[PDB]
Amino acid sequence: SHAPVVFTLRTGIAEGRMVYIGVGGDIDRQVNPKLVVHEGETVQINLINGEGAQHDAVIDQYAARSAIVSGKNASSTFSFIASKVGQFDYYCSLPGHRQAGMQGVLQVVPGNRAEMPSTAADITRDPADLPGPIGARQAKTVRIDLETVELKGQLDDKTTYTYWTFNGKVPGPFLRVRVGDTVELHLKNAKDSLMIHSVDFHGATGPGGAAAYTQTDPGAETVVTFKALVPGIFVYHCATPSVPNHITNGMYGLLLVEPEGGLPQVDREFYVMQGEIYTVKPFGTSGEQEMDYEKLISEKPEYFLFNGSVGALTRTHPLYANVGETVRIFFGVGGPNFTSSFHVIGEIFDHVYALGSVTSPPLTGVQTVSVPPGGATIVDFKLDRGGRYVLVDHALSRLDHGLVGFLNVDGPKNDAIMHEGPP
Amino acid sequence: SHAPVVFTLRTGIAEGRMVYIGVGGDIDRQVNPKLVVHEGETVQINLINGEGAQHDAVIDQYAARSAIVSGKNASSTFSFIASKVGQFDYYCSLPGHRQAGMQGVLQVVPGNRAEMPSTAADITRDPADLPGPIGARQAKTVRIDLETVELKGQLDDKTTYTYWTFNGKVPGPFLRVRVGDTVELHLKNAKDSLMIHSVDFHGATGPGGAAAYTQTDPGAETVVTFKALVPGIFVYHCATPSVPNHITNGMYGLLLVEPEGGLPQVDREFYVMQGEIYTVKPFGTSGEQEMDYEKLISEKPEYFLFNGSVGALTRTHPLYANVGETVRIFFGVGGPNFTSSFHVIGEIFDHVYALGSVTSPPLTGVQTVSVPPGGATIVDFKLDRGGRYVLVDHALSRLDHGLVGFLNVDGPKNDAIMHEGPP
Ligand SMILES: O=N[O-]
Ligand SMILES: O=N[O-]
Ligand SMILES: [Cu+2]
Ligand SMILES: [Cu+2]
Ligand SMILES: [Cu+2]
Ligand SMILES: [Cu+2]
Ligand SMILES: [Cu+2]
Ligand SMILES: [Cu+2]
Questions:
Q1: Which residue of B has its CA nearest to A19?
Q2: Which positions in this protein are listed as binding Cu(2+) 2 (chains A, B) (predicted)?
């Protein structure tokens, strides 16, 4: 699995004994905590030396163990598949340490992990939720309605956050016009909003890319008209101060201005944006997460997310496609601050629309592409065969802050393209 | 023995192991220190819990152990006689703790502990260094010469201190006159003094008990005349500010004004004074000790002393007498701050001159007497048999800050007054 169940253990002194102490998630501050796992899960255990004696962690029945950590903060992580149901001791093998109290239980339970019942609104955009290619047709006036809505969202399994959105979801609505079109934009600020909201389009020409015309009080509406003069895949975002605050809380989307010829024919299109959230408490903490200004202005986030939430593109709203289909991903970074190294594990991009230019020829046979904040790109590839394909920022420490997505494709395990054993 | 060899161990994590860490003395900060002891010595080990797991210390061959100490700072002291030469493990008996590093050696060496060659002047006043009884004699004019002297002294085995003294010793000269006498006092302050010095006698009547006429610059001399109008046993001390500072540094002594008859004849007299020293580093620290002003004004000393130094009346200048003698101790407290609960282990005070009154009838058959700072008394008793008799302040935590003394008396171990076995 590419979504492991993760436990962190710090060694220390508690309850009169030398013990393991849980760090974060369901086990924060618990001594020799029970590590509860469902049959077939991939288990990652992070050991961190707390007090400065020599430690490891060993699970006999799984032939699994950490390395020995000597100094304070010295760390070793290990993994295994929970293939066996029952109760297994994790313990320190250093002389005396097990007898001194370094022992807990790993419990492996039969059947799959139930999903935790949510407490707040689902604020993740389905990656399939976008309008398809516009016909060939004459340029014309297109009317777009945007509503700025502040609302609590399910950030993780048992953690919530106050999101600011376009139309109650992150990213906002996928906007699709033809070059030459005239856009008639209506921005309504919901009555229950505390804050002024706005929108800047990177595909609009003029002051604030429309921000100067769209500063909207709560319970008010603004209206602006603008010509789509350039074809491109453009990010749009709120542009009321603090702009970085409005962006991190979720006020970003994509505007595709199609060129006259349209993009190349493709079997299936998806919508994905990457952002950061700057919380007071670390990734994994349950309850109401709140915003940490000091972390926002110093570019030190706790959450890296696709489409608004942890599990957004794995559990709640993953991507589905069929073997033999050509797939297009419109991929944008709201940010506000981090450049994404976008990669699909198990795939190679046939075409990459460099800097999101839709008029310059796309680059060919590319593994991984840099997308800046306030930037976007288009990748396409042919699905030759089945598998779970994984969307990642190849700054791979971001796996441990929520940044992972699934493209699920039904097919055999073994074919001519990739198989176990030799020819 | 009333001079046990003392070691303090704190449990902790050091050199990547769970260990014992030496606290002060020759073992400060050493991990699992070697405890070096001489054959026949009484050993005291204080175990203090550092990090908060359960611990003890055990030495198999001496059937000795601490109690189990559980939380941080929890302590257990134990003792035994080092009767067998060789090497012996002290260890923690809690499950795994020995294996995990909680083990050191006690080395019992043959022969007697050698004394450290001293590095500074001996500032200790011998308890026999006082003038004998004044004959019957008419009242008259007596000239007394005092010199105020600043000098480093041997405070302990391997520790020094800047003492301020009358005539280079602590306490100062025992002054002996008859009531009605006229005292011609000369006070020479040494050239090499940083500070002004002076003297207030409690047996003198008028401004500052002479202090107003004795404020003496370095290299200068004051002369003052005063009448000894009252019989008593009077403490005298420097009266130059800070007076507490001048007293702690050594500037106290005793003035006996004999009544017309003189005091009842006794076979042998002794001179003893108690005081405190207020150092930055705790009791037992080697090196030059320095004064801590915050500890002096808050009355939190590190040394409690008889006649100026640790070992003053045990090692360097102890008391000596013979069976059948009547003994008198002039005992005063310089202080500056603490009241002494004066007592001689193995003896009872035949007479106590309550509040140092020499004219009121003495109290009889008294175990222990309170002497305030700036007060003295007289005690006498008959030595009915032999032994080492021990001078103490019976606030007995002051044993561990250097306050103990020996009266050595040659006689058999067993006799009619106290013996092994039944009658
Ligand atoms: O394929 N790398 O995540
Ligand atoms: O017997 N007194 O310590
Ligand atoms: Cu361990
Ligand atoms: Cu906004
Ligand atoms: Cu922008
Ligand atoms: Cu122990
Ligand atoms: Cu003085
Ligand atoms: Cu006084």
A1: B53
A2: 197, 238, 246, 251
